[PDB]
């Protein structure tokens, strides 16, 4: 109801509330109103700039599907569960001068810079073994955070939740609805509910169990697929 309003009545006093730059605009004030509604009962709201250690933007050179070079990812590899589904399809055949930090490592936080207004700012965590070094494209940000206060996967789950979707649909600056590009400035200024680490682990556990249930559903699905295969084979053989 609040998000689909298209009209905001803003008071003058409301402008200078955690603003520090006196920004008045429809999008910024709509985002602030939605955040005020969200964080009403929730407490312990804190900025991400205090608990951020560093942010490094990746970069990707010219490449073709295949090419027998070092592999690169795609925009479809990002997932809502917060796990980077590593399955590169394209690679770069020519070499660069420096590639030390352009590879993907385990336990990293990747942020989507440029994508559709819906799937922008999408975050993922690399949990599987990287083994071979793989290049992550320019539309990514490696985010190193303070591990003592905030857990790596909790931020990804928050960003993929509506908490981050609503913020990034108004903060994103793009020339079209197909691609909108976020930057690091709003990552510095973003406000989060940061409960004790125990609560973050509890949330992660609930998400993991409710995703394992769905995993049981698709494993039943390939059980049905194998049944189809067996029926075809037994019909053909005799």
């Amino acid at each position: 109801a609040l998000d689909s309003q298209r009209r905001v009545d803003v008071g003058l006093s409301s402008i200078s509330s955690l603003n520090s730059t006196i920004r008045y605009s429809y999008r910024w004030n709509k985002m602030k109103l939605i955040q005020k509604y969200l964080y009403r009962d929730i407490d312990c709201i804190e900025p991400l700039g205090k608990y951020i250690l560093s942010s490094n933007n990746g970069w990707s050179p010219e490449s073709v599907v295949g090419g027998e070079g070092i592999p690169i990812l795609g925009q479809e590899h990002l997932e809502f569960d917060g796990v980077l589904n590593v399955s590169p399809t394209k690679a770069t055949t020519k070499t660069k001068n420096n590639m030390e930090n352009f590879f993907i490592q385990e336990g990293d936080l990747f942020i989507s810079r440029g994508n559709t207004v819906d799937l922008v700012g999408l975050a993922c965590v690399v949990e599987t073994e990287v083994t071979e070094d793989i290049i992550y494209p320019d539309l990514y940000i490696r985010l190193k955070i303070d591990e003592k206060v905030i857990h790596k996967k909790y931020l990804a789950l928050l960003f993929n939740s509506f908490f981050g979707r609503l913020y990034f649909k108004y903060v994103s600056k793009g020339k079209n609805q197909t691609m909108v590009k976020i930057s690091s400035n709003e990552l510095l200024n973003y406000y989060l509910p940061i409960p004790p680490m125990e609560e973050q682990l509890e949330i992660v556990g609930k998400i993991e169990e409710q995703i394992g249930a769905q995993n049981e559903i698709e494993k039943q699905i390939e059980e049905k697929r194998n049944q189809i295969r067996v029926i075809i084979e037994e019909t053909a053989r005799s």
Partner: protein, 916 residues
């Protein structure tokens, strides 16, 4: 019924020799048996046959020519490709030597502007056949038509010498050669009647018909533009210069002498396209020595009414010939020609001008939303009622004058026609309205006093001036002297000048502010690129001229032009609203303006020329009392913050950093440190921080709080960068404190669509989301849709009754005849009967929709007035009635001001915000 048809019928009937008969009541025409006809003409094919008969009568009776040399309805049979073609020639008159003296093609007067494409299909083939057969040359080709001026029939004709231009290339370079407007008797060379004031026949046209202007526009698009050449700036500029020259002609040539725009034609035959360049150039100097009063000798010396390299003179002579009788300054006098020329020129700008980065036009739907969202109509009505004046609108960046033109057409329409009931009927108000709007021939007469503008581009300045002359204004106030030049430089001959006046303002900083205008609407350029010749205005005249963003100077200009309480509606880029570098300007507006609406716009608004997000800002200038209150509150809270900063930084050094206490500190500081009044310690932290602290912070120890904050407390401690204007205090802290006291509500909204989508190819309609058209007029006349509509149907009923009587007489006269030979014409009479029954069938069918629309009129209208429940067009049913079927006419495309129902952003603008 039309008077001219009856006049023509009477003129043809008054002739002594009864050779042709017409009957409009019966809709029949009959001709003498002397000329053989291959078909039985029984129905009126159009005005073409009447014009041909009139020309035949004029030739036979008035010009005393022998009828034996006249040939009409000549049949040709040719085999073209796989088909057969039968072209026809209208009038052939040959002399004693056999050469065609008159080769006349007859066309309907209302079909001339659209039939030109068929001319090539009717004339060149016959000439080619004649060359193939006899290898002879035709001497003169004559194209004739009639025109109605003051109930008098005048003749406008084109005479082309075939031998003079034997080839198509020579004919194209000739530019529609017309030897003379009228013919001459006694084998004389053709002569054109002078176009001179004094004689009504010689005088120009003032009753401009609505349709031929569209034909002229499409002909210019198809001929001047080459068909394959679109969006060329230089051709448009040449056309603009030609129109300006024509305007100067009516301005200066005055009465008693012929105009110099027309071909002077000292000789009987029209001369070559040359020897007119000197004429038009001297005329183009007389213009800009009379209207613009320019003082550039190099610009006068370079001439350049046209450029010879890309504007050949054949198109020039075509344009000159096309615009001989279309008096622009006097065509607006007539009600029919009131808005014809303005629409013509706005179509010229719309189709022909190429616009891109830096130079592009604001779309009309945004302009009208800006003008109506300021309640400019209500402001003008209130100004007229209270102070007997109209608002003083200025647009300091008017490129094509779109904002000014829309403001003019809005004020005139609202005050004079739409909302005329709001204005009072007092004698003083009535006389002021008399000298403003009443004469009704030039209703845009007030503009000369109340409409200003500034443009930096000379070419677009001339374009704006000519556009706004053709729309009705004198266009004296539009300046081509840059938007940001000082108020002293803006000088022009006419005495009442509200832009010259200036005076320093103590609050502004001693800088000079005008303070004379009521409304300031503009579309500020993204980058001003201010000229290096006069850079003293950057520093001395403007507060923030030294900054990198030089476009933000425009906002400061808007403070100087507006009056205390004036209105400002502008399309600012979104970067002004959300960028730290622009913060200084955002603190500026809140200091002096009362922000009232920030309407965001989609990025499809300015496509395809630019793709950047822009927003609408509506603000009102603040009076001296409010800004001095702001200044005093700013000073108070800045001093309080100044004390808090020093105190809290002294607190940090001891209580966290550990530096021993010193007696050089403030007495309250030292005693609070000594006797440990930690409650005040916490209170000062809370007050200095304001936000950035939560409920957990109050219980937690102060030392850990300070360690945790550090960065935030340092950021708050740092003062501002602009200095002088703000006064060494923190803008965020003091701004929050002052805005708590002076709170007012701001309205914000976003539009997703703007009623159009301009791809590179063309426009495609979309939902508006900004405003809704009325779609239903507030004044509908029953007698306008009833009597004239029924005249045709009852005339046809009388005609078919007479036809039925004569058919019955023929039926009897064939009943007493023998059947075997009768059968063929009896079947023909049956065909006539079935034609009559089917025609009366569609008349009955259209009478049904007549009845249903009459029922709708009775249901929705009461004494030609929309009822209060139907006043606000929320009823989609009535709207769908008007925009369907035959109710396409009499529509109202005006913007609807509902004032009680909120559906689209403009309604929330006009209801939610208050301008006072």
């Amino acid at each position: 019924m039309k008077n001219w048809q009856r006049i023509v019928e009477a003129k043809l009937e008054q002739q002594k020799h009864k050779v042709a008969e017409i009957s409009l009541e019966n809709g029949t025409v009959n001709y003498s048996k002397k000329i053989k006809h291959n078909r039985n003409l029984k129905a009126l094919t159009g005005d073409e046959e009447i014009v041909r008969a009139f020309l035949i009568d004029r030739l036979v009776n008035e010009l005393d020519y022998k009828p034996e040399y006249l040939e009409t309805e000549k049949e040709y049979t040719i085999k073209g490709g796989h088909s057969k073609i039968n072209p026809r020639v209208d009038v052939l008159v040959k002399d004693d030597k056999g050469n065609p003296f008159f080769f006349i093609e007859v066309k309907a007067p209302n079909k001339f502007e659209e039939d030109k494409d068929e001319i090539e299909g009717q004339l060149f083939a016959l000439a080619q056949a004649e060359e193939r057969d006899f290898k002879t040359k035709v001497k003169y080709l004559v194209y004739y038509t009639v025109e109605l001026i003051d109930d008098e029939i005048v003749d406008r004709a084109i005479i082309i010498d075939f031998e003079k231009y034997p080839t198509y290339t020579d004919w194209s370079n000739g530019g529609f050669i017309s030897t003379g407007t009228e013919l001459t008797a006694g084998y004389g060379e053709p002569k054109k009647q002078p176009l001179i004031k004094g004689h009504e026949k010689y005088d120009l046209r003032v009753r401009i018909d609505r349709e031929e202007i569209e034909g002229l526009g499409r002909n210019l698009h198809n001929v001047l533009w080459g068909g394959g050449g679109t969006n060329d700036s230089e051709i448009f500029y040449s056309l603009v210069n030609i129109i300006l020259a024509k305007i100067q002609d009516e301005y200066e040539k005055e009465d008693g002498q012929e105009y110099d725009f027309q071909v002077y034609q000292y000789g009987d035959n029209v001369e070559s396209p040359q020897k007119l360049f000197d004429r038009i150039n001297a005329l183009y100097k007389r213009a800009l020595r009379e209207q613009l009063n320019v003082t550039d000798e190099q610009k006068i010396a370079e001439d350049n009414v046209i450029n010879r390299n890309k504007f050949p003179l054949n198109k020039l002579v075509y344009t000159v010939q096309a615009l001989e009788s279309l008096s622009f300054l006097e065509g607006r006098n007539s009600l029919d020609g009131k808005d014809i020329l303005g629409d013509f020129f706005e179509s010229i700008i719309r189709d022909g001008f190429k616009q891109t980065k830096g130079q592009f036009f604001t779309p009309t739907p945004i302009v009208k939303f800006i003008l109506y969202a300021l309640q400019l109509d209500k402001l003008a009505i209130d100004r007229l009622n209270n102070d007997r004046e109209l608002p003083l609108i200025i647009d300091p960046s008017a490129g094509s004058g779109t904002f000014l033109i829309e403001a003019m057409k809005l004020i005139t329409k609202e005050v004079k026609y739409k909302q005329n009931h709001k204005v009072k009927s007092s004698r003083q108000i009535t006389k002021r309205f008399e000298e403003l709007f009443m004469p009704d021939h030039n209703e845009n007469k007030w503009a000369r006093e109340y409409l200003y503008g500034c443009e930096i581009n000379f070419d677009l300045g001339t374009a704006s001036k000519v556009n706004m002359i053709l729309h009705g204004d004198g266009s004296a106030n539009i300046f081509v002297q840059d938007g940001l030049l000082p108020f002293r430089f803006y000088v022009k001959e006419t005495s009442p000048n509200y832009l010259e006046t200036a005076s320093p303002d103590a609050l502004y900083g001693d800088k000079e502010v005008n303070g004379k205008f009521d409304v300031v609407v503009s579309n500020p350029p993204f980058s001003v690129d201010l000229d290096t010749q006069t850079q003293r205005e950057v520093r001395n005249a403007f507060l923030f001229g030294d900054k990198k963003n030089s476009e933000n100077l425009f906002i400061e200009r808007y403070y100087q032009l507006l009056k205390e309480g004036g209105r400002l509606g502008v399309v600012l880029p979104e970067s002004v609203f959300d960028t730290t570098e622009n913060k200084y300007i955002r603190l500026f507006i809140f200091k002096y303006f009362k922000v009232k609406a920030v309407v965001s716009l989609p990025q499809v608004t300015f496509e395809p020329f630019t793709s950047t997000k822009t927003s609408l800002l509506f603000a009102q200038k603040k009076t001296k009392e409010e800004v001095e209150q702001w200044n005093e509150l700013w000073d108070k809270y800045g001093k309080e913050w100044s004390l808090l900063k020093t105190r809290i930084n002294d607190y940090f050094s001891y209580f966290v950093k550990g530096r021993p206490l010193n007696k050089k500190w403030a007495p309250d500081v030292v005693k609070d440190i000594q006797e440990g009044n930690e409650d005040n310690i916490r209170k000062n932290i809370f007050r200095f921080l304001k936000d950035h602290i939560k409920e957990e912070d109050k219980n937690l120890e102060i030392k850990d709080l300070l360690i945790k904050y550090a960065e935030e407390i340092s950021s708050i401690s740092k003062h501002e960068k602009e200095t002088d204007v703000f006064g060494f205090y923190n803008a965020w802290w003091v701004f929050g404190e002052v805005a708590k006291e002076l709170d007012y509500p701001i309205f914000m909204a976003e539009a997703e669509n703007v009623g159009y989508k301009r791809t590179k190819k063309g426009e495609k309609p979309m939902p508006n989301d900004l405003y809704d058209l009325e779609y239903a007029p507030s004044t509908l006349d029953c007698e306008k849709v009833l009597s004239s509509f029924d005249i045709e149907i009852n005339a046809l009923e009388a005609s078919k009754t007479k036809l039925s009587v004569e058919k019955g007489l023929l039926e009897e006269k064939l009943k007493d005849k023998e059947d075997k030979e009768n059968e063929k014409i009896q079947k023909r009479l049956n065909k006539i009967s079935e034609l009559l029954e089917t025609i009366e069938n569609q008349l009955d069918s259209i009478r049904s929709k007549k009845l249903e629309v009459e029922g709708i009129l009775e249901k929705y209208y009461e004494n030609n007035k929309l009822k209060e429940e139907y006043s606000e067009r929320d009823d989609e049913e009535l709207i769908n009635h008007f925009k369907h079927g035959v109710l396409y006419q009499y529509r109202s495309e005006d913007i609807l001001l509902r004032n009680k129902t909120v559906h689209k952003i403009l309604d929330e603008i006009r209801q939610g915000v208050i301008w006072d």
